[PDB]
Amino acid sequence: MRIPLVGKDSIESKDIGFTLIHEHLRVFSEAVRQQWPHLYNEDEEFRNAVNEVKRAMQFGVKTIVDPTVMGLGRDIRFMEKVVKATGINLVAGTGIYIYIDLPFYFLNRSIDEIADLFIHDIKEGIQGTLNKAGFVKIAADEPGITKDVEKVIRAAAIANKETKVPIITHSNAHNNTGLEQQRILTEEGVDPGKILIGHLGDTDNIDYIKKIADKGSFIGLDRYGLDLFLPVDKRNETTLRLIKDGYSDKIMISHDYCCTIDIGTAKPEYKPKLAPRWSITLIFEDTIPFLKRNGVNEEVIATIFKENPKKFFS
Amino acid sequence: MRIPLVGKDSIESKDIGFTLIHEHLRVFSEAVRQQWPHLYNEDEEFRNAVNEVKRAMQFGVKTIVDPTVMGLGRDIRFMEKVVKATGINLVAGTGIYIYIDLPFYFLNRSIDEIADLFIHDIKEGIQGTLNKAGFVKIAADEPGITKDVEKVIRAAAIANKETKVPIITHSNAHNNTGLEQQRILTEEGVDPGKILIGHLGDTDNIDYIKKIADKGSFIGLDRYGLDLFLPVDKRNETTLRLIKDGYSDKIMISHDYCCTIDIGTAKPEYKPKLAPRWSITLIFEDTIPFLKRNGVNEEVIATIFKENPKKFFS
Ligand SMILES: CCCCCCCCCC(=O)N[C@H]1CCSC1=O
Ligand SMILES: CCCCCCCCCC(=O)N[C@H]1CCSC1=O
Ligand SMILES: [Co+2]
Ligand SMILES: [Co+2]
Ligand SMILES: [Fe+2]
Ligand SMILES: [Fe+2]
């Protein structure tokens, strides 16, 4: 017992198997869904998540890590239902996803108070259930490291030191938010190897990507299919080059796929342009085959999808 | 019938009686309550709301207008419960309360889509019930009229023009947001007399306040008790001056009282410093008696608390 699973006994990290380290069963804006429920369709949402997960499993995915947290509409009971329907190993997290400011709740509250929220989810359980958080998720994006973003990062560090769960980040690959997240976490005493810096796959600036890896953290080549950020072929070229340059033991790969997401950008009519082949199994259809016919040994595949997740959670 | 009430048949505006135009039964951050329910206590929240409303009614309040909307934790079923327990006339609103950016939901969504949400609440009902919204609430504060804040303002104008419900605003009294809100709404073709520009009582700059009244809108002297914004006695002096200068036709008075609110600023420890006498009945204890001692007659009080709300909703 080591990594907590939704709706299951916890597992030892050696038993995680082939892992997708960053996918979403469902993403929504909490306040919008609360205020305007007519916009949403839970049956559709359930069907989509179950269908995607089932296809992932038939490609041999054993574990999915789902970093839906506050600000992305985390719902542990929804996650429970998808587990019961599929039998997936599902790792749920805690944390806060913001780009600018915290919710008004956090006015005149300390970093300690925020960390207490994360530690609650990890140690006690999530949203009144006994499903526990297996990692902390934090974000920064275009606005950079604002005061409140930094507060959340330091709170995540406190949670990691207390509970030893790893940290997954959302960053923007085109500013230095990823590097800064790494810096602040490590200065606060987080083991660099307990950090996945997210969304670095959004750039082909490999010098920047290697910088983070060199400082000891996993690098998230983690949005395969999201062409609007970076097209699949450039992602593949970047992935291949990083492998050839010796970085396979820092690489993590995923789709960031949202089986449903409520943002207007994800309207069906935009899909062909923005994310034509985006799904939870694209890497099996494209990336892994591509790697194998470009000289990449099976051992590297094992490293990225089994060994690295195992280390991360160890 | 043409003001909708929570849990009651709609009433004619002439029957609104003595009104508190801006009070909150309960405020919370949607995403925080959703993610960490352990932080909250609905029984306590209910008791607080019921007790405050009961005292208001003892002092002759017939109708309370509650501008709790998206971003402040509007919950129409909680509101229903308080109505059942008290018998108050309660006017619920629709709208969006943001200072900077919209929820991610609204990425690549039009102003029209926003207005449709408001119009849904007005014409169809709120959160899956048949309780309908009687006004739209919008906000701006220190960050000023941002792109997204502006979008919401324009959506409110669409809603008013379509349904004729009035608009209540939140503004920052020190940075012209209230005047800008008025300008944008009236430029869109909203009748100035269907706008309440909020939180103008937070300043004793009467030149600024008069500017807004002169352009035909109601002026919100509406945070009595919140000394951290402006002390009661200075509000009183400002209120009295405006009345002496003939402006009672535009004056609206309230507390902005929150029977519960979840922000750290409102920890009990802080109340004596920030808001010692803040409650839903302060104006009966202090303000109204003060005005009377200064020669303000019953008719003026009736204009402010009965006639003006009547006009607002007519
Ligand atoms: C029609 C399809 C277009 C793609 C949707 C727009 C891009 C959405 C990206 C997205 O899902 N971002 C969130 C969710 C998981 S991580 C994160 O920060
Ligand atoms: C210790 C008690 C002092 C309260 C300080 C916090 C002031 C909150 C005022 C307040 O209510 N502001 C928001 C929330 C409801 S409407 C609105 O615009
Ligand atoms: Co992300
Ligand atoms: Co306000
Ligand atoms: Fe994600
Ligand atoms: Fe308010």
Numbering used by the authors:
A (entry chain C), B (entry chain A): 1 to 314
Provide passages from the article that reported this PDB entry.
PLLs are natural lactonases endowed with promiscuous phosphotriesterase activity. Indeed, W263 is located at the start of loop 8, involved in the dimer interface of the enzyme and positions the lactone cycle of the substrate onto the bi-metallic catalytic center.
Co-crystallization assays with C10-HTL were performed using the same protocol but adding 4 µL of a 60 mM C10-HTL solution (in Ethyl acetate:DMSO; 1:1) to 120 µL of the protein solution. Crystals were first transferred to a cryoprotectant solution composed of the reservoir solution and 20% (v/v) glycerol, a 1/30 (v/v) ratio of a 60 mM C10 HTL solution was added to the cryo-protectant solution for co-crystallization trials. The diffraction data for W263F and W263I-C10 HTL crystals were collected at the Proxima-1 beam line (SOLEIL, Gif-sur-Yvette, France) using a PILATUS-6M detector. However, whereas detergent-induced flexibility has no effect on the lactonase activity, we isolated variants of W263 that exhibit increased lactonase activities (W263T/V/I). These variants exhibit dramatic improvement of their oxo-lactonase catalytic efficiencies (148-fold for variant W263T), while the activity for the best AHL substrate is compromised (3-oxo-C10 AHL; for the wild-type enzyme). The residues selected in the LacSV group (T, V, I) are overall smaller than those selected in the PteSV group (F, L, M) with the exception of isoleucine (I). Noteworthy, subtle changes, such as W263L or W263I, yield to a large tradeoff in catalytic activities.
